[PDB]
Amino acid sequence: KIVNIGAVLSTRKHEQMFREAVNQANKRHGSWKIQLNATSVTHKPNAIQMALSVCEDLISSQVYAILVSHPPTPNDHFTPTPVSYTAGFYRIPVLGLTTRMSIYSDKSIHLSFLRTVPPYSHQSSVWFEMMRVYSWNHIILLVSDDHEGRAAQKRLETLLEERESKAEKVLQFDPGTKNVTALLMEAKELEARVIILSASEDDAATVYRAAAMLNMTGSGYVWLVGEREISGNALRYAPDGILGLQLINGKNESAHISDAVGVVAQAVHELLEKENITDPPRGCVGNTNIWKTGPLFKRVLMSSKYADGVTGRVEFNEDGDRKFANYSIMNLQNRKLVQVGIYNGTHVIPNDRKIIWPGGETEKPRGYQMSTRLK
Amino acid sequence: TVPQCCYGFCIDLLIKLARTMNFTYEVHLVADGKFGTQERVNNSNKKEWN
Amino acid sequence: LNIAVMLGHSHDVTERELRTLWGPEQAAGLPLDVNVVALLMNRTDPKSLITHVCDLMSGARIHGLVFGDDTDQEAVAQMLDFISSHTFVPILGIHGGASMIMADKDPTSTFFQFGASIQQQATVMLKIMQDYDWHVFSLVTTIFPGYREFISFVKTTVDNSFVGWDMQNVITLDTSFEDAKTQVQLKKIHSSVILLYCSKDEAVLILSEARSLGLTGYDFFWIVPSLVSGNTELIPKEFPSGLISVSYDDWDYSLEARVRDGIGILTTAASSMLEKFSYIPEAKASCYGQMERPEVPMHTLHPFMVNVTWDGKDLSFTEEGYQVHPRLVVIVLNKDREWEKVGKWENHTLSLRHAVWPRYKSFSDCEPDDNHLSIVTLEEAPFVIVEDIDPLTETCVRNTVPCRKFVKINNSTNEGMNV
Amino acid sequence: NVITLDTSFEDAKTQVQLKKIHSSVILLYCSKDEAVLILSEARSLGLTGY
Ligand SMILES: *[C@@H]1O[C@H](CO)[C@@H](O)[C@H](O)[C@H]1NC(C)=O
Ligand SMILES: *[C@@H]1O[C@H](CO)[C@@H](O)[C@H](O)[C@H]1NC(C)=O
DSSP states (O other): OOOEEEEEESSHHHHHHHHHHHHHHTTSSSOOSSOOEEOOEEOOSSHHHHHHHHHHHTGGGTOSOEEEOOOSOSSSOOOSHHHHHHHTTTTOOEEESSOOOTTTTSTTTSSSOEESSOOTHHHHHHHHHHHHHHTOOOOEEEEESSHHHHHHHHHHHHHHGGGTOOOSOEEEEOTTOSOTHHHHHHHHSSSOOEEEEESOHHHHHHHHHHHHHTTOOSTTOEEEEOSGGGSGGGGTSOOSOEEEEEETTOSOSHHHHHHHHHHHHHHHHHHHHHSOOOOOOSSSSSOOOOOSSHHHHHHHHHSOOEEEETTEEEOBOTTSOBOSOOEEEEEESSSOEEEEEEESSSOOOOOSSOOOOTTSOOSOOOSOOOOOOOO | OOOOOOOSSHHHHHHHHHHHTTOOOOOOOOSSOSOOOBOOOSSTTOOOBO | OOEEEEEOSSSOHHHHHHHHHHSTTSSSOOSSOOOBOOEEOSOOOHHHHHHHHHHHHHTTOOOEEEBOOOSOOSHHHHHHHHHHHHHOOOBOBOSSTTSSOOSOOOTTOOBOOSOOOSHHHHHHHHHHHHHHTOOBOOEEEBOOTTOHHHHHHHHHHHHHOSSOOBOOOOOOBOSTTOSSSHHHHHHSOOOSEEEEESOHHHHHHHHHHHHHHTOOOSSOEEEEOTTTSOOTTOOOTTOOTTOEEEEOOSSSOOHHHHHHHHHHHHHHHHHHHHHHOOOOOOOOSSSSOOSSOOOOSSOOSTTTTSSOEETTEEOOBOSSSOBSSOOOEEEEEOTTSOEEEOOOSOSTTOOOOOOOOOOOOOOSSOOOOOOOOOOOOOOOSTTOOOOOOOSSTTSSOSSOOOOOOBOOOSSSOOOOOBO | OOOOOOSTTOSSSHHHHHHSOOOSOOOOOSOHHHHHHHHHHHHHHTOOOO
16 A cells, blocks of 8 residues: 655755655654655756656656646746646646646646646636725726636626626737737726736736826726736836735745645545555556546545645635635835735735825725716 | 708707706717618628617 | 658558558649658557657658547647647647547647537537527536536527527536436426537436436437537447437548548648748757747748638638538437438538438337327418528528428429428 | 326336426325325425425
């Protein structure tokens, strides 16, 4: 009764510390004599080299999951796509550290992807909750031509339609356009005065510069900014009045990995005690079958509940991602981040700090201004 | 699109509504001259008004 | 400059190599002659695939890689997507594991497959509904990633449709094996035509529940999508006859017919590329090793093959990469659990049928019924104003009854279409 | 037509019998023990609406 799980990690010190962490977790809470075997591999930038290492280390060692961490450099993408694709042959579950892209959310592209970071779709839920608690009905949306942006727009539409409320219109941008001035003007020529930004960092910076040079930073113009659009050039080319969002305990690495490996060990024990388990082929060449425990892992993990994590109970959505994560509303005051609101599940907890708005006003504006220019 | 000078029956009601409801009306004329209903065009599976 | 086609163990290697060699030599000779490097193996291991890709790359910079398969796994499509995201080599999908297209079209991907998307299947289903004059819908779907958008698209289409069929709220099964709410969900539907959007394994249990509740009557009609009934030779006992499905198979096409079309498309793309530019594209010097991000200096082949005509058979691709004029041969389950061709969709993106209405006989249960009451009607007296199908409106009026009549064509032959 | 339950604990035809009725007012002629299971089947099928 020995199970070996491979790990993909960036640096050697991380490998050693995570090996020690999983060895300690093998004895934390309730555990048996032999449950896990500690193995790890380095994060190789070369695709062929990393694929060969994965095949020669994990497949040939009877693994049930892949412990792949986030790329060391956030600037580069280095998306964990090849590992998920290789694990999709036998529906092998994988571990996502902070991969927040919506590409892995759908199961049509990635058959079995599991991550501990909530998707970008939760930004739509945050916006909906803020509108509900601040009485906002008419809202325009600015989404670029991206798969994640389209998914977020669909989530917003399906979350707002249940209250018999529909957005006025949604503008589509492109990754690289520099003449969005016409789109900004046609968005300004609207009844609503609340704008939501959800795009790449460079596009967000460009559109914010266009808004600043077109005098869109005035009073009564509430700006909503996503998680990824508050860094980079945003900290330099953005005045106060920004309603930013940030994940609580998100950038931390070891905070969630221990809980994830504990959940993996518990799932392995449950699978061992449930029924017969099929074993993966030893060599990487010679077998192209499909695991019979593939859907079984999803069935036993989606309904699994574990309160031993640092964030209380652990629950998974229909896409096998983190459910009910902790969010934090970010406000900018003289290029300084100020914490006011937090999210812990269908609740809002504002702090004593006043929420400022663009133009220097200290009162919440209204999005209903009738210009009386009825054609 | 030369400016014309149209008047009649509904103009008085429109002026009264504008006076009593903070409205600033801009009267325009139909470019087609028809009320507009469902019509069939290329890709006739589309119900768009004219 | 070089063409490589991947095959399996279904047929002999020598004849496949010979036919691939003499394919391009049939007509439309290329200015630069191309060769064939055909590799045949039963297994489809990823390491074998990447080694074969590297060998083809070392084969004098092969520009065209035709990938075939014989299994029923969709992960090979993902693996080929990831491979083409770096090798920058266009690949045409053939029969096998690449037939099912379900992955998102990557911006750097160079795939133009022969598969059928869900978007172009809803129109075929609507055309079938119009032909059958069935004005009752029931979108009994299942929660899967990417089905909410399909439901929104179909509801917008039916709302936009002039016919305006009866629409009911989507009564979907929340979670599998509820055993307490499935009965409520099955009681929430009281119609005759039900559309299903699920997988094969869940469709099996859905059909079992329908059999337990008794939803296999004469008036009941069912339509099964392509992804559920893709495997034609495996028919579970819980599938009653009459399951109308729309897909493409090898009844009217062959691997040779597909590879000839693929090589013709590749030749047309090469000709379009040579029309504008006069530079031969070059591949990566190495097989897969790289230390920096890759890029394509010259323009890709996507804008060149937007408009492709092959001997009067326009086989083009959309922006994503889906075909414009697929096959979509309609298949209806036989009384003895077989699949037969009952129409075609390539005829100017329209629907065709053999005019065989009654096929839903009591098979799973034993209860005869007399529902299709045959009626004969004439037009001599001024009591009937029956008129032929008008091209405008919705092929008829909102207040009419479907009819049929044998139209004469020749003074000797008795054959007449049931228009 | 009288849609009656032939034998108790059929488990294969009771669902068909419950699907054969599509009305709102139902009269019962049985015993207490069998009425208990009939009501349980109705609850499973959801026949306790307004
Ligand atoms: C991450 O969380 C763990 C436990 O919550 C803590 O010990 C560690 O210091 C955190 N990491 C950082 C960088 O603060
Ligand atoms: C709207 O009506 C009020 C009277 O209630 C008036 O004081 C105000 O000037 C009006 N606004 C405009 C733009 O005419």
